[PDB]
Design a binder for this molecule. Structure first.
Ligand SMILES: O=c1ccn([C@H]2C[C@H](O)[C@@H](COP(=O)(O)O)O2)c(=O)[nH]1
Ligand SMILES: O=c1ccn([C@H]2C[C@H](O)[C@@H](COP(=O)(O)O)O2)c(=O)[nH]1
Ligand SMILES: [K+]
Lengths: 316, 316
């Protein structure tokens, strides 16, 4: 089946993944160097052995394509994947004058009392960003995240470079280029960042009128992250191919350090006992071609019939 | 055998490599996305089915580690791998007042007369760089090449960053880091470069006291380039592991666009009929540990018994 490479990766990590401790104090089982490809003409690689929220994937990817770096857009689409990173800024800023939120991550996980007060200052924060423009501009802006790295790379001369927009033109005028690359890794910023980009760099390739894309992911969470990671890039490949009038090819996903956090074992095993169902189909808007102007309704998934969602804890 | 992954790659390109035209007007057979690993505790992956000049590999790698960007160092070790790039600068500069060298590449290949006058201005040039300091500093300095990207990345604040030196310290103080990355790809420079780095980015990884390294190569010449490419990185892995007092693990080589130029077919087939011999052994200087101060005699290859060298044309 289409998603088999994912299940195979999981099994492999359980079979030969050596224990490797990580900063979160949790502990993982990892491997270094792995590659899996997906033939996109066979369907969309959105996992059927577990329910994955495509809406969250669409809204975040579009957020990226717009070159946006402000959470507000996401909150407007009920997407809370990036909230924590912004909330941190708020909590640490001197303008914050409320309950102490020191390491609200594991604390809210190990404390029932805190896991409500924390969930209050957060909802409070999300309200200010959505309504208070001055607040949104100050605390709702992440700064260095995919949207600005892809479309607004800052140069030494003080300008900005639209990597993605440029690369798309190169594909149109020089499809056989072996330099169709986009990097999110900047040696200058990396040491001062809280989370240096996981999806380090990707390359496009064209042959026989078909667009393929390879992604180099330096670190990956087999259970929680990868299911999303695959759909984001399999989707970007379609969008870029839509814009360039090409056919879709393969999505090659390359891993540096792929891992399973020890607290997800039973969950991954449970999923592995499920039998993949036929994959869904993607449907992009034919009358609209500028993918940078795309919006939710311009992308639709058909025939996604997944197994029930599987719950698992986070790693902290 | 140790080098089998290389032979397997070659066969695969001959079997399923679709024709894909390239800028050099030559024409290639390519594939997108491939990965091969080499267990470095089994020997040094220097091809035995064809003679490869290790000396050229040592001298170029050391040139890189020193953060050097001037050809002089190479010429002093009889290494002419980078000459053309510098020679171009000379020929195009107004200070050049001699025979016309327009596209001296294919011209020297399609003309017997020219393939001597060109080989004269070149030897002349190599003499000036080696003896004329002012000339060396002006024309012998490549500027943006691996040595400066690895150890002197220019920031917007006008400073310089030693990526490699920093990463080596991170390994020593945080071996389990999933951020042990070095990038040679800078979105600001790429569009103005004659040859954007082929070896785009690499990552280190540690487990059980063993250092592994994965390389992402965006473009590769299966016949002429890869045999070198493999030894350079299998060697850097040893040097970095020497410096950090770790054991050696695997060298994972990841390809974006791997290709065979149509004029190397008979040569690759011929090599494929040869049977790999036992791989050589590397030997680094035990009393010397600062790899940045390493020199030729500090690295030695033992038991390399290759088949005769195979001749093939260049692509232009
Ligand atoms: O899109 C994402 C974002 C994060 N992670 C995971 C990778 C690691 O589990 C953790 C980041 O830890 P570091 O690799 O930065 O050290 O988050 C993913 O798999 N995919
Ligand atoms: O170390 C190197 C340097 C160059 N090449 C090859 C790759 C391509 O054949 C050509 C560069 O063409 P572009 O990919 O830049 O377009 O040189 C290698 O394989 N290895
Ligand atoms: K980069």
């Amino acid at each position: 089946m289409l998603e088999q490479p994912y299940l195979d990766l999981a099994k492999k990590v359980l079979d030969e993944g050596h224990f490797k401790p990580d900063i979160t104090h949790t502990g993982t089982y990892s491997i270094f160097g792995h590659q899996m490809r997906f033939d996109l003409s066979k369907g969309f690689p959105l996992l059927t052995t577990k329910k994955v929220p495509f809406g969250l994937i669409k809204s975040e990817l579009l957020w990226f394509l717009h070159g946006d770096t402000n959470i507000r857009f996401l909150l407007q689409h009920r997407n809370h994947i990036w909230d924590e990173w912004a909330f941190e800024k708020w909590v640490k800023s001197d303008e914050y004058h409320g309950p102490d939120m020191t390491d609200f991550g594991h604390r809210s996980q190990k404390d029932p009392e805190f896991a409500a007060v924390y969930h209050e200052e957060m909802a409070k924060f999300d309200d200010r960003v959505l309504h208070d423009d001055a607040f949104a501009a100050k605390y709702g802006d992440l700064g260095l995240v995919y949207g600005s790295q892809w479309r607004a790379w800052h140069t030494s001369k003080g300008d900005t470079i639209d990597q993605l927009g440029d690369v798309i033109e190169q594909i149109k005028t020089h499809p056989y280029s072996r330099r169709l690359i986009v990097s999110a890794w900047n040696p200058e910023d990396v040491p001062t960042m809280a989370l240096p980009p996981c999806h380090t760099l990707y390359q496009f390739y064209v042959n026989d009128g078909k667009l393929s894309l390879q992604l180099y992911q330096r670190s990956a969470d087999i259970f929680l992250g990868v299911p999303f990671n695959i759909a984001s890039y399999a989707l970007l490949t379609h969008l870029v191919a839509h814009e360039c009038g090409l056919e879709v090819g393969e999505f090659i996903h390359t891993f540096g350090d792929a891992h399973l956090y020890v607290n997800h074992l039973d969950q991954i095993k449970e999923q592995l006992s499920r039998t993949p169902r036929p994959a869904p189909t993607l449907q992009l808007n034919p009358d609209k071609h500028d993918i940078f102007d795309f919006d939710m309704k311009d992308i639709k998934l058909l025939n996604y019939d997944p197994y029930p969602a599987i719950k698992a804890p986070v790693a902290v």
